[PDB]
């Protein structure tokens, strides 16, 4: 799949492959071409690093294309989310660990080891290499324009280690606030206005009643996705023993990442009791 990237939200979060977690489409598409075809200090330090750079440079390239060559925050976050997954793969915390990823894990184990002391060497190797992998993902974005280049994306913000489930809630919440206005804008067009003099269009108008079943189907996947992701967060936070600086509930992660995040409305939105939804899709 190191060819091109499916359009944003062409495919939603996959909560079925592994039942305990939802996986975003970007994680599947993560380019691991060279990292699989690998079949002695130089075994890891020089060779494995080059292989990971060749993959990171591609990911950083197709992600720039995914974002229509826009050099904005939406692009930097795709870099941040993907660079982390590269790390969880190296550090043995890849939550998916399915299919082609199983080959990469076996490749890394035949390099570092298999015991507890191997994760440390791998976690250490990621720390002393994560910076260089970020410069690789920024390759295409930096080659493209020799001049006029700016460090829009920042390094330490991307190489800050954080449990994988955290960074996926960040990506999810960013997808939710982008999708909600759309599913509402569609609802507004077909349901605004009053039908006769005081009744709502959804009571009788099929066109409006249909846009509601589309939103009803969408918001239900969001509620369910939030349920799984927040439960998987509680399982990890309880098992890690690290304080991760001010995050207790998964709602804190959205407050940090989202601007003007009103979790009161968020709870209302995903539970179909918000204001706009009642005015448009609830008759009585």
């Amino acid at each position, epitope marked *: 799949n190191c060819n091109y990237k499916r359009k944003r939200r062409e495919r939603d979060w996959d909560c079925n492959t592994k039942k305990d977690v939802c996986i975003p489409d970007r994680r599947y598409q993560l380019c691991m071409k*060279e990292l699989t075809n690998l079949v002695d200090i130089t075994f890891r330090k*020089l*060779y494995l*690093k*080059r292989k990971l*750079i*060749y993959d990171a*440079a*591609v990911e950083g*390239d197709l992600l720039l294309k995914l974002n229509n060559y826009r050099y904005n925050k939406d692009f930097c976050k795709d870099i941040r989310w993907s660079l982390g997954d590269f790390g969880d793969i190296i550090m043995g915390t890849d939550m998916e660990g399915i299919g082609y990823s199983k080959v990469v894990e076996n490749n890394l184990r035949s390099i570092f080891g298999t015991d507890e002391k191997a994760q440390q060497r791998r976690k250490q190797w990621w720390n002393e290499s994560k910076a*260089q992998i970020w*410069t*690789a993902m*920024m*390759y*295409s*974005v*930096k*080659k*493209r324009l*020799k*001049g006029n*280049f700016i460090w829009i994306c920042k390094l330490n913000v991307a190489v800050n280690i954080e449990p994988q489930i955290y960074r996926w809630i960040r990506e999810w919440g960013r997808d939710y606030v982008s999708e909600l206005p759309t599913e509402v804008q569609k609802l507004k067009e077909k349901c605004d206005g009053k039908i006769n003099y005081t009744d709502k269009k959804v009571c009788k108008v099929p066109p409006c009643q249909n846009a509601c079943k589309s939103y009803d189907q969408w918001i239900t996947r969001k509620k369910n996705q939030w349920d799984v992701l927040s439960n998987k967060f509680i399982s990890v936070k309880n098992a890690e023993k690290v304080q991760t600086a001010g995050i207790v509930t998964p709602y804190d992660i959205l407050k940090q990442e989202l601007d003007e995040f009103n979790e009161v409305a968020f709870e209302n939105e995903i539970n179909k009791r918000d204001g706009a939804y009642i005015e448009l899709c609830v008759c009585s």
Partner: single-chain antibody
Amino acid sequence: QVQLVQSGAEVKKPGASVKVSCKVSGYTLTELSMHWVRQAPGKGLEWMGGFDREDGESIYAQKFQGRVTLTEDTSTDSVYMELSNLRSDDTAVYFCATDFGGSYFYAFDIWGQGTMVTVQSVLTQSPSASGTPGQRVTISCSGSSSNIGRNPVNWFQHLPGTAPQLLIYSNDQRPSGVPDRFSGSKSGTSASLAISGLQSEDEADYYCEAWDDSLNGVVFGGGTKLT
């Protein structure tokens, strides 16, 4: 706008030393790698060394490790490369070039104008090619699996008199200014450049470049000239 300006032509006596400058203009030197390559009048392009900034610890070619020393001066925003024990066959034109965004990549982007100094290869290309306006031509590059097999390939359009320019990188991708008629491909142990619709601006010698895992250095091909 990012320029590289080198020092004037120098003439030395066999056995002496020579120091060439290379100044950046339009971007902080502190981020670039600043490699160097030379080309004798009769021979082709050869890579000497460079400063791998991501790791420090500059690297050099094989039978050059005892003659080249790269220095730097952040105040003057320039790089210096010194050659000692100058032999008669070291007469050539010396270039400084960088990838500008590469960590372990060598798809050079910004080249200097060269410096005239007066005192085979792992990759194998076809000795020469020839074509007529409007046809497809295919220059091929062939090497072992330790240089082209497991690493990306680049292509260069060098017009003698001027400095080479990046034509293709990562075996498939073309820069902005490169025409759409150019295109690259790689498979197994051989890459190939393709010019769909040979026009008049093909008056150049074409080289392929890749990274050799066994040599730990940048290697160039023999060369190929179209007409």
